[PDB]
Structures are given as structure tokens and as C-alpha cells.
Amino acid sequence: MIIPVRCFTCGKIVGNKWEAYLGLLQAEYTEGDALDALGLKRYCCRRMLLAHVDLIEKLLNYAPLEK
Amino acid sequence: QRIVATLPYIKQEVPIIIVFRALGFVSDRDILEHIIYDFEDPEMMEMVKPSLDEAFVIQEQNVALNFIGSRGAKPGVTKEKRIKYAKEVLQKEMLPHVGVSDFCETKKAYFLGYMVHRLLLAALGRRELDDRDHYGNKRLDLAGPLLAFLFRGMFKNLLKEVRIYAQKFIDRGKDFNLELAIKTRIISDGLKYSLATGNWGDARAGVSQVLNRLTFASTLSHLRRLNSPIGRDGKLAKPRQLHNTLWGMVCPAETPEGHAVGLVKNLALMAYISVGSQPSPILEFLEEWSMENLEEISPAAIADATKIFVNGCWVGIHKDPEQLMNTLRKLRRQMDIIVSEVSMIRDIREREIRIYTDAGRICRPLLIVEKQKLLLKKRHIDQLKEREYNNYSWQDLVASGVVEYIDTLEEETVMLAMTPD
Amino acid sequence: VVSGAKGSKINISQVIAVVGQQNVEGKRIPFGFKHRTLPHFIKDDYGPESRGFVENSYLAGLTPTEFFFHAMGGREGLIDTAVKTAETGYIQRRLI
Amino acid sequence: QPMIYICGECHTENEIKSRDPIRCRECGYRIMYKKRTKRLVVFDAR
Amino acid sequence: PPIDLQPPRYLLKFEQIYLSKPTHWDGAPSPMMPNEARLRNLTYSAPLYVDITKTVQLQTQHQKTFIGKIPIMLRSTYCLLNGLTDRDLCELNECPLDPGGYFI
Amino acid sequence: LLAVQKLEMWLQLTRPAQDLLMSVCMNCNTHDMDVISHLIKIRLKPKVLLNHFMLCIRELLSAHKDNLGTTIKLVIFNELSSARNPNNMQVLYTALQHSSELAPKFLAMVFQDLLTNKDDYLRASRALLREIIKQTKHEINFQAFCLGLMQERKEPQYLEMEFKERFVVHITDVLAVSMMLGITAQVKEAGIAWDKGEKRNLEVLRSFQNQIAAIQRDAVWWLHTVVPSISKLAPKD
RNA sequence: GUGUGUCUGGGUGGUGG
Ligand SMILES: [Mg+2]
Ligand SMILES: [Zn+2]
Ligand SMILES: [Zn+2]
Numbered sequence: 001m002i003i004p005v006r007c008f009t010c011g012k013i014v015g016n017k018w019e020a021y022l023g024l025l026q027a028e029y030t031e032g033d034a035l036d037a038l039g040l041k042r043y044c045c046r047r048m049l050l051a052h053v054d055l056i057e058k059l060l061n062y063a064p065l066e067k
Numbered sequence: 068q069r070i071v072a073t074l075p076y077i078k079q080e081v082p083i084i085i086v087f088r089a090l091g092f093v094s095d096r097d098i099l100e101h102i103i104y105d106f107e108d109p110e111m112m113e114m115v116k117p118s119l120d121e122a123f124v125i126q127e128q129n130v131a132l133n134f135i136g137s138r139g140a141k142p143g144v145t146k147e148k149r150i151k152y153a154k155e156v157l158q159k160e161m162l163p164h165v166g167v168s169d170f171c172e173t174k175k176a177y178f179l180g181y182m183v184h185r186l187l188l189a190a191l192g193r194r195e196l197d198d199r200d201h202y203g204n205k206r207l208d209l210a211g212p213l214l215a216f217l218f219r220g221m222f223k224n225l226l227k228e229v230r231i232y233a234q235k236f237i238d239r240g241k242d243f244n245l246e247l248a249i250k251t252r253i254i255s256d257g258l259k260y261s262l263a264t265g266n267w268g269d270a271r272a273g274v275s276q277v278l279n280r281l282t283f284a285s286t287l288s289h290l291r292r293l294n295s296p297i298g299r300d301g302k303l304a305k306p307r308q309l310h311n312t313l314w315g316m317v318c319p320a321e322t323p324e325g326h327a328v329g330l331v332k333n334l335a336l337m338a339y340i341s342v343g344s345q346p347s348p349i350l351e352f353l354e355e356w357s358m359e360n361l362e363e364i365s366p367a368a369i370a371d372a373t374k375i376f377v378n379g380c381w382v383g384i385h386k387d388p389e390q391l392m393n394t395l396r397k398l399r400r401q402m403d404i405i406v407s408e409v410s411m412i413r414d415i416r417e418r419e420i421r422i423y424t425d426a427g428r429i430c431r432p433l434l435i436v437e438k439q440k441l442l443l444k445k446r447h448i449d450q451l452k453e454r455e456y457n458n459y460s461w462q463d464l465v466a467s468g469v470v471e472y473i474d475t476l477e478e479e480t481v482m483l484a485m486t487p488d
Numbered sequence: 489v490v491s492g493a494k495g496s497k498i499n500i501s502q503v504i505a506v507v508g509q510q511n512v513e514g515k516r517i518p519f520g521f522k523h524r525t526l527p528h529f530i531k532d533d534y535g536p537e538s539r540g541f542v543e544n545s546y547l548a549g550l551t552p553t554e555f556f557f558h559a560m561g562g563r564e565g566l567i568d569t570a571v572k573t574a575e576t577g578y579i580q581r582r583l584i
Numbered sequence: 585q586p587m588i589y590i591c592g593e594c595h596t597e598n599e600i601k602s603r604d605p606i607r608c609r610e611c612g613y614r615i616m617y618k619k620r621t622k623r624l625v626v627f628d629a630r
Numbered sequence: 631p632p633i634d635l636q637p638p639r640y641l642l643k644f645e646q647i648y649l650s651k652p653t654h655w656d657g658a659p660s661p662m663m664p665n666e667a668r669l670r671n672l673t674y675s676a677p678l679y680v681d682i683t684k685t686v687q688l689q690t691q692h693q694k695t696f697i698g699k700i701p702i703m704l705r706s707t708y709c710l711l712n713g714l715t716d717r718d719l720c721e722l723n724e725c726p727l728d729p730g731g732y733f734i
Numbered sequence: 735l736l737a738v739q740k741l742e743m744w745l746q747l748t749r750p751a752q753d754l755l756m757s758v759c760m761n762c763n764t765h766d767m768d769v770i771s772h773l774i775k776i777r778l779k780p781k782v783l784l785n786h787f788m789l790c791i792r793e794l795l796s797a798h799k800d801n802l803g804t805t806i807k808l809v810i811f812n813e814l815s816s817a818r819n820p821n822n823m824q825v826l827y828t829a830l831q832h833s834s835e836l837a838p839k840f841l842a843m844v845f846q847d848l849l850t851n852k853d854d855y856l857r858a859s860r861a862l863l864r865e866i867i868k869q870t871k872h873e874i875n876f877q878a879f880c881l882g883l884m885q886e887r888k889e890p891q892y893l894e895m896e897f898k899e900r901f902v903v904h905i906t907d908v909l910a911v912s913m914m915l916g917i918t919a920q921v922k923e924a925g926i927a928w929d930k931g932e933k934r935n936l937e938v939l940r941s942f943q944n945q946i947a948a949i950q951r952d953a954v955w956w957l958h959t960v961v962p963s964i965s966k967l968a969p970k971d
Numbered sequence: 972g973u974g975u976g977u978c979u980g981g982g983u984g985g986u987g988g
Contacts (some may be wrong), residue, residue: 061720065617067595195522210703218700225697226633229642233635240638245684245692254698258675262701262733265983276984278732289985290731304571308512309563311520314527319559325986328566332745457861467820468779483527484553615669 001055009044017049070118070183075160079138082121083183089131089157090176095122098364101180102187111168111187140477163200164380177361178381194417202312203476205409206427207340213267213274214258220268221257228253271296288321291334299326306330312475316429335431339472341408343426348404356391358383373418378425388413388420395422400435401470405464410474423474432465432473433483441487443469507542507550510557512564516540517557526553589616640686644667648694652702652710664704664711665723674734675699676708696713705730735773738821741786742778751786755793762800770804771811777819784797787821791828798829803839805829810844811860813855820947823862827870834873839882846883846909850902863915867922876916877952884959896966903964906956907971913953921945 011044017038024034035046070083087098090424101105103111125131129150136143136153143149157175159167160304165178188194197204208216261267265275279285297306307329321333354360358375359368360383372384385391392413398405406429410423435442447469448461464470473481489495502508512518517540523531529538537543540557544550550558588597591608592615598608606616631642652674654662661722678700682692702709709730711719716726738759741751765857778786794801802920805826814820847857867874884906891900924942927935961967 015727062723063595063721065592065595066590066619178708197541198520201520214700230635233633233642237635245682246695249697251696251698254678255675255699257700258701259675272982273984275733279985283727287729290729302571304567307563307567307570309560311518311525311560312557319563322563322566323986324566324570326570327985328570330561397780401783402777405707457865458858466777466779478527479522481527485528614665 001054001059003052003054004048007045009048010050012040012042012045014040014045014048018052018054021049025026037041068114068117069121070115070186072179074135074369076140076156077135077138078140081135081138082118083130083179084122084156085134086123086126086179087176088122089306090172090179091128091133091151091457092176093126093128095119097366098180101176102183104184104370106370108190111184114187114190126261127450162409164378174361174381181381198311200308200310201475202310202316202429203479204371205429206425207429208427209340209342211342212426215259217261217267221254222255224253225249251273288333293317293332293334295332297330299330312478314478315431316475330475336456337429337431338429339408341410341424341426341428341430341474344409344424345405346422346424349409349422349424350379350382352382352398352404353377356394371418373420376419376421378423379421385420388418392420400471402466408474408476412474412476412480415480421476423476428474430474432470432480433473434470435468436482436484473483503546505545507545507558509536509555510540510542510554510561512540512560517560526556528553588619590619591616638686640684640688643683643685645683646681646682648681649708650654650677651708652676654689655709661710663722663724664709664734672734673699673701674704675701689732701733703733704728735769735776735862738773738776738778738786740788741772741789742780742783745782745785749787752793755789756796758790759793759797759800762797762804765800765803767807767811769899770807771815771817774804774808775812775817775822778821778827783821786868787824790821791824794825794828795832798833799836801829802833802840805837806844809841810848812862813845813848813858814852816854816858818858819915820860820899821866826862827866830866830874831870834956835875835878835882838876838879840873840881840887842909843877843887843889844901846880846905847888847892849905849908850898853901856905856908860909860912860915863912867916867918869919871919874916874918876909877913877949879916880912880956881952882910889963899964899966903960903967905950906960906963910953910957910960913949916949917946958962 003015005013005015007014017040020038021031021034024037025031029037031050035049037043038049040049071080072083073080074086074087084098087101092098092101099112100106102115106112125134132153133146135149135156136149139149139152139156141152143152157172158169162175162178165171165175167409177430185194189196228250229248233243236243262275264272266272267274276289277291295306305329309329313319313332315335316338318335319334322328322329353375359372361381364384369384373387373388374381375383375385393413395411397404399407399409399411406424407423408428410428410430411420412423413420443464447464447467450457451464489497489500502574503544510517517525519525521527524533525538525540533539537553540560542550542554542558586599589600589606590597591611591613593613594610595608595609598615598616599615599621600606606614608616619628632641634641652662653659653676654672655668660671662674664674666672676699677696678698679694681694683694684690687703689700705711711722711724711730716723719726737754740754746750751883792806805828808822809826812822826837830841845855845859849859863874863876891901893899921940921942924935924938928939932939
């Protein structure tokens with residue numbers, strides 16, 4: 001539901017790359033070009049940052065059970 | 068080769084012509100006219116001969132009623148109650164979809180002659196034998212009719228309870244509290260019990276299942292599931308077969324692999340079961356469009372004309388069915404008094420038009436092709452691209468006459484294109 | 489295949505060349521509709537494509553009519569397995 | 585002894601004693617949640 | 631059919647149905663949300679009201695009398711989740727992507 | 735309604751359809767909006783109905799004033815009843831293109847009265863105006879429409895209630911901003927050309943600038959007249 | 972200066988090999 005810290009296959013850190021990827025997409029860069037600009041050359045990491053679903057945002061819509 | 072009928076709530080079988088005479092047809096010509104429509108045809112008139120020999124004992128209506136009333140579950144010893152029982156059976160039990168009140172015996176006789184005629188057509192091979200696995204001959208009892216069936220018996224029990232209560236209090240000559248007279252708990256208890264256990268009525272079990280929340284696909288599959296109540300242990304492998312009619316309605320792949328193969332089925336993506344609609348606009352429109360009713364026609368006029376059926380009830384005939392079908396399709400595409408889910412089938416080889424409005428019919432949207440061109444044009448797509456902006460919805464596309472819902476029975480007579488190229 | 493570990497030459501042919509003829513109850517696809525297998529076909533069409541012959545292979549990709557016919561054949565296989573299990577079970581119990 | 589629950593809606597802390605009606609102290613909600621334990625929570629970061 | 635019991639004699643007839651939104655009771659009535667029904671093991675039902683004539687003439691109108699409770703399929707026109715936005719559905723601790731179509 | 739149904743039925747002769755359309759035009763000249771919704775706003779699907787709509791549109795061009803009144807009533811019914819039809823839209827295009835600032839003025843007065851009265855009408859009105867500007871591209875001047883709408887047809891009457899007055903003020907502010915939506919397809923093409931190059935099509939650029947200046951003057955007049963119209967006007971807004 | 976009671980009997984549905 002949240003971006004994994006490490007790529008499953010090789011172990012490159014991709015926990016810091018989700019927000020930069022979203023910013024590049026908002027900058028009308030093609031997701032292939034966005035992934036290229038983030039240095040993810042191995043297609044394992046491209047899969048990592050490309051197939052991720054940002055479901056933690058949907059969970060944040062619900063109220064906390066205690067404040 | 069005498070013809071026999073199994074009248075409801077009668078222990079022993081009866082000849083058909085005896086039922087015809089009991090309906091009020093002493094003569095023989097009118098009966099065969101109601102059965103046979105082409106008197107120049109001698110073959111169907113030939114095979115109906117061994118039935119007619121059973122008419123020797125019975126010509127009068129009274130003795131026919133005596134025969135069809137003496138074989139009931141409750142024995143009848145004297146004349147008048149046997150006649151009353153036969154009249155009650157022939158008025159209320161058999162063929163209620165044609166008529167339940169009085170002044171409908173002739174329509175019931177017409178339908179009975181029609182079904183005998185259908186049997187004779189099948190016997191000669193002029194008409195194909197019906198297929199039990201055809202999805203057009205099947206109705207899907209959704210939540211609506213199931214809850215309605217429960218509620219009917221439950222309300223009947225409530226009325227019985229309040230009747231017993233009132234009868235008990237009346238003997239003392241006292242008024243009451245009506246709220247105290249209505250034990251409100253039985254309806255809620257019955258609905259809750261049936262919804263929880265899944266036992267329907269009283270016979271039928273497993274209707275209600277716990278929603279499978281393992282994954283989202285499981286929830287969607289469970290909500291769109293449908294079950295065939297045919298015997299799971301049965302050796303007949305015909306109903307488990309993936310019938311050809313399941314195309315576009317039912318998923319061909321999705322089925323349990325255990326003992327429930329082919330009986331439990333899942334809807335296709337675009338499939339949409341009909342919810343039901345009243346047939347009164349159908350009937351009022353048809354009479355406005357030269358639909359000559361059964362009560363006004365001569366029985367010989369149906370030799371060439373085409374029968375018209377509304378929800379399985381034969382009402383009237385039409386001289387020219389082609390333009391009738393064209394204008395009905397125009398009305399359906401134009402979103403007039405007739406709704407989209409109404410099925411419009413026309414058997415052409417045997418002159419019949421059958422209009423259906425009942426619930427449980429399965430249908431899916433399809434694009435419409437006219438003059439080898441798609442009625443859908445670039446303008447619809449351009450509007451649909453701005454769907455979130457100008458609220459041009461799929462409903463507008465249906466109302467534009469570009470798409471329509473085709474039932475399985477209607478799917479028989481369509482010519483379907485896989486793709487525009 | 490030649491090692492005999494798994495598969496068959498029929499599997500090779502179906503994957504590469506031609507899936508073949510789909511059958512229901514030992515015969516071709518029946519006229520479930522009125523004188524046609526599917527509404528996409530002309531009435532009284534006895535040709536290969538109309539009656540279940542899957543021209544394409546598993547590599548090229550089945551056309552949707554062929555997909556449906558292949559589904560019918562697979563369903564026949566599954567039903568046969570499901571009834572066969574119970575029948576043979578009772579026979580075996582009596583035999584022992 | 586001073587058992588604390590959490591309202592489902594108000595997310596308020598309520599001193600509910602034994603064999604008491606389960607009522608919120610603000611909105612009167614019927615559903616209450618328990619607070620996380622105090623003993624020790626340790627996980628090896630695997 | 632209208633049930634009739636007899637001397638004096640009165641006739642009972644039901645004319646109109648009135649189904650309110652789902653509620654739960656105890657003290658004052660309160661609307662019940664599907665999450666509340668799931669957690670508290672309540673039947674997500676709605677009360678069914680009818681109006682009855684008792685003519686003995688001496689015509690008495692029992693407007694809107696309770697006769698039973700009917701379960702409500704979720705996300706239907708009479709469920710409490712009908713027509714709500716995603717933000718409102720989330721605020722009720724309900725999943726906006728949930729399709730409904732089931733009873734509780 | 736007999737005109738549209740008969741014209742569609744006779745469609746796949748020409749003289750009988752034209753005669754029926756002329757009779758409908760005479761009736762419209764004779765002359766609330768329920769009949770217009772029942773006849774003009776009927777959503778008939780077939781292309782025979784499209785031929786009927788074309789014949790009625792030609793008659794509407796022949797009967798520009800009464801057609802403008804009927805189209806204004808149809809637009810009012812479409813906005814208030816939350817429904818629309820392609821035939822009603824085509825009739826609206828014909829009425830707008832036939833008589834400049836006559837059909838849109840009354841239509842916008844009816845729309846402003848409805849918006850002051852009921853909500854859920856600004857988005858539909860904006861979409862209808864955008865569709866009309868894209869398709870017809872003739873005499874679609876919503877600036878004059880809004881200017882006429884400000885005070886003529888029941889403008890004090892539709893703002894009697896506090897909520898109604900607030901709706902009227904919001905509708906007036908939207909119409910003050912709707913001048914951009916009121917530009918026709920030629921102005922949009924000129925904007926595309928200016929995006930390609932600000933100097934290309936200098937004469938077309940000057941014509942678009944003059945039309946936009948007229949629209950801006952109308953919007954400024956609407957903004958100036960709105961403040962005395964609404965007592966509950968917010969200073970910052 | 973200790974220590975055994977573990978809600979049975981039916982029905983329905985889903986599932987795995
Ligand atoms: Mg096995
Ligand atoms: Zn990697
Ligand atoms: Zn609270």
C-alpha cells in the first residue's frame with residue numbers, strides 16, 4: 001500500500017523515488033523518461049516504481065481511531 | 068395416438084377434447100378450428116383423429132365437467148360439488164396467465180388449442196423440439212423476486228394471525244388494539260431467518276450465502292454469481308454443459324471445478340438481467356396499431372396472420388408483422404412508453420411475435436448496424452470524451468438509438484458482427 | 489517431448505501450428521441457437537469456422553468464436569472428470 | 585483499574601468501569617475501542 | 631385480499647406502504663450505518679409502515695402503523711449510502727470502491 | 735405534439751412537411767414552457783427525426799421571432815427539468831443563428847431566472863453554450879444575452895428570497911465570467927492561430943479583438959449593474 | 972507443603988487435492 005523501501009529483485013532503494021516520479025509525471029514527462037531520469041535502468045526497479053499502487057493515500061482518508 | 072392433458076390438481080389424466088367441451092364447446096368444428104388453423108392441411112387433421120374417438124361418451128358440457136371434476140384429490144360424491152370443483156379448477160388453476168376471472172374461457176381455449184397445435188407441429192417435425200438448456204427458456208430469480216416470494220407467504224401468515232386474533236376477540240363481543248393485533252415480529256423474523264440460513268420458505272436452501280471477502284475479485288464474483296438449482300448429484304450431464312446461448316451473458320471460463328461444474332455460473336461483464344416491467348403500455352399501444360384481438364376475430368383469420376404473445380399470453384393477431392416490428396424497434400430506440408429491457412422476438416418460419424417484459428430475462432448491450440454502417444459515429448465518441456464535463460452519459464447513448472439490450476431469445480434472430488471491420 | 493518427461497506431439501502441434509477441431513459429446517459444436525452455433529454466423533453454416541474448427545494456434549491467438557468453442561470443449565472434459573470420479577468410486581468399493 | 589476506552593466517533597478517552605453501559609461521554613456512541621497495551625512491543629526489523 | 635370478520639361486522643383494508651430509512655433503537659431512534667450494523671451484529675433493516683382502514687360507516691384510519699422490518703440491500707435507493715460522495719463515504723468508515731449489493 | 739412526429743413519419747415528400755412546419759410557426763407566433771418541452775425537447779432517435787428537425791429549423795429561420803420565443807421556453811424547460819434533446823439543441827442553434835441577440839437574450843433571461851430560482855443549472859448552461867459555439871458558429875453572442883438577462887425578464891422577481899438572491903448574485907458573477915464561454919468557433923480558431931503566432935491573421939485578430947472588446951464591455955456593464963442588484967454582495971468577491 | 976473441566980447434536984454453504 002506504500003512504496004517499498006528496496007527493490008525486491010536487486011535491492012536498489014526506491015522508497016525515495018516515488019514522489020520524484022510523481023513530480024516528473026506532473027511535469028508531463030513520459031513515465032519511461034521519468035524512470036530513466038531517476039536512474040532506474042534495470043527493469044526490475046522500473047517494474048518496482050512503475051507497478052506500485054499508492055494505496056496509503058486511500059487509507060489516510062479514513063479517520064484515525066484515536067487522536 | 069390420442070392426445071392427453073395433465074390438468075393440475077387432478078389425480079388421473081384426461082383427454083384434451085373433454086377439456087375443450089368442458090370449456091363450453093359442444094360442437095366439434097370450433098374445437099378443431101381452435102386447434103388446427105389450416106383446414107386444407109390434412110396431416111395434422113389426420114393425427115388428431117384418435118383423440119376424437121374419445122368424444123363418444125361426452126358431448127354435453129355437464130358430463131365433461133363431471134369427468135374432469137370426479138378425479139380430484141378430494142373425492143366428489145354428488146353432482147353439484149363435482150361441477151363446482153371442475154369449474155373452480157378450469158377457472159383458477161389451469162392457465163392463469165391467460166385469465167383468472169370469468170369471461171376468459173374463450174381465451175383459455177385459444178391458448179390450449181395453441182399448445183396442442185404446438186405439440187402436433189413438434190410431432191410432425193414442422194416445429195423444432197425445445198431445448199431445455201436454452202438460456203432464453205430460463206429466468207434468473209434475482210433478489211427482487213426471491214424477497215417478494217418470501218414476503219407473499221409471510222404476509223399471508225400475518226393476515227392469518229390477525230384473522231385468528233380477531234375471531235378470538237369477536238366471540239366476546241369486544242373491540243381491541245390493532246397494534247396489539249398485528250404481531251409485527253413474524254415478518255422481521257421470517258425475513259431475517261431466510262436471509263441468514265438461506266432456507267427459502269416452509270424446500271429451497273443455499274439461496275443466501277455469506278459474501279466472500281477474501282479479495283475484491285471474489286466479492287465481485289460472488290455478487291455476480293448465479294446458481295442453477297438442478298440436482299448436483301444427478302448423472303445427466305446436459306445442464307452442466309456450456310450451452311451456446313451463454314455467449315455474452317455468462318462467463319465461459321468462470322465455474323467451480325468440483326461437483327458444481329456448470330451449475331454455478333458467473334455473469335459476463337456487460338450482462339444485465341431484466342428487472343421486469345408492466346405490459347399494459349404494450350397492450351394499449353398494440354390495439355392503437357391495428358392489433359385485432361382474439362375476442363373480435365373470426366377463427367379462420369389466423370390461418371395466414373401472425374400470432375402476437377405478450378409475456379407468454381397470446382393476445383390477438385396482426386396481418387402484417389414486418390412494419391409492426393419496425394415501428395416497435397423504432398419506439399424502443401426512441402425511448403418511448405416501451406422500455407429498453409423489453410425483449411422483441413419474431414419467429415418468422417412459424418408466424419409468431421413474442422413480446423416479453425417479465426423479470427429474470429438476461430440481456431447485454433450491443434451496437435446497432437443499419438445499411439452495413441455503425442449508427443455510432445464520431446460525434447458520440449467526441450461527446451463521450453467530455454463525459455465528466457457535459458454529463459453526456461451512457462443513458463444518452465441508449466436514448467440516441469445507437470445501442471440496445473438484446474435478450475437471449477432476441478439474440479436468436481439477430482445478425483451479429485464481431486467487429487466493425 | 490522426445491524425452492517423454494511431459495507433453496506430447498499433439499501439444500506441440502496445438503501450440504505451434506493448429507489447435508484443431510473442438511468437439512462436444514464426440515461431434516462438432518451443436519446448433520445451440522436456431523440452426524447456428526453463434527449469432528455471428530449465418531443460418532446453416534457447416535464450414536470449419538462456424539462449427540468449432542480453431543484455425544489459429546495457441547501462439548497466434550484464438551479468435552473469440554474459437555475461444556468460446558474451446559471453452560465448451562474444456563467444460564465437457566471437466567464434467568466428464570467430475571461424474572467419473574463418483575461412478576468409479578462406487579464401482580471400486582463394490583469390487584473390493 | 586481505570587480502564588480507558590476510545591469512542592469510535594469522538595476518539596475520546598472514557599473511564600468506563602466494570603459492568604457499565606457502553607456509552608460515550610460526549611456523543612453516546614455504542615462502540616468503544618481499547619488502547620494499545622503498555623507492556624513491551626519489540627520487533628526485530630526484518 | 632381484505633380480510634373480513636363478523637351481529638356486528640368490520641372490514642380491514644391496507645392501502646399504502648411507507649418504508650423509512652434504516653434506524654436503530656434503548657432510547658430515541660437513531661439512523662444506523664452499515665459499519666455500525668457490521669460491528670454491533672445488527673440487522674441493517676428498515677421499518678415498514680402501512681395505513682389500515684377499519685370500517686365497522688365507522689371508518690377508522692390507522693395511518694402509518696408498524697408491521698415489520700425489512701432488510702435493506704446496501705447502496706440501494708433506500709440504503710443510507712445512496713448518492714453519497716467518496717469523501718462522505720470515507721467519513722462514515724465505508725469503502726467508496728465497495729459495490730454494495732448485499733444485505734447485513 | 736403532432737408537428738415533429740408527423741414530419742419524422744413522412745420523412746424517409748417535402749411540401750406536406752413544410753406546410754406542417756409553417757402551421758407550427760403560425761401557432762408559435764400565436765403562442766408556459768410545458769408544451770415546448772413536450773414538442774421541441776422530444777428526444778427522437780432516428781434520422782427521419784433529424785430530417786424533421788432540419789425542416790423545423792428552416793421554418794424557425796422563416797419565423798425567427800416566434801422561434802426565438804419557443805427556443806427560450808425550451809431552454810428554460812431544459813434547464814429546470816434537468817433534461818435535454820438533440821432536436822431541442824438543433825432548434826436552439828437555428829434560433830440563435832437566425833436572429834442575433836434575440837434568441838440568446840431571452841434564453842439567458844430564462845436561464846438566469848431559473849438559476850436564481852433553482853440550482854444545478856450553471857454547468858448545463860455552460861456546456862450548452864460551448865456546444866453551440868463549437869457547432870453553429872453564427873450569432874452566438876452570450877455577452878448580449880447576459881446583458882439582456884440582467885434586468886429584463888423577472889430579474890427582481892427571481893431574487894426575492896435570501897437563497898434566491900444569493901443564487902442570482904452567483905449567476906450574475908458567473909455570467910460576468912461567462913464572456914469567455916460566449917465566444918464563437920471563429921474566436922476559438924483565432925485563439926488557436928494566436929497560439930501558433932500572435933501576428934498571423936492580423937485582420938482576423940483585429941476582428942476577434944473588437945468582438946472580445948464588445949463582450950468585455952458587456953461583462954463590465956453586467957458587473958456594474960450586479961452590485962446594486964444584490965444587497966448581500968460580498969465586498970471581496 | 973501443587974495439578975484436567977476443554978458445548979455437544981444436526982443442517983447449509985464455500986473451498987483444497
Ligand atoms: Mg486429484
Ligand atoms: Zn532492482
Ligand atoms: Zn463519542
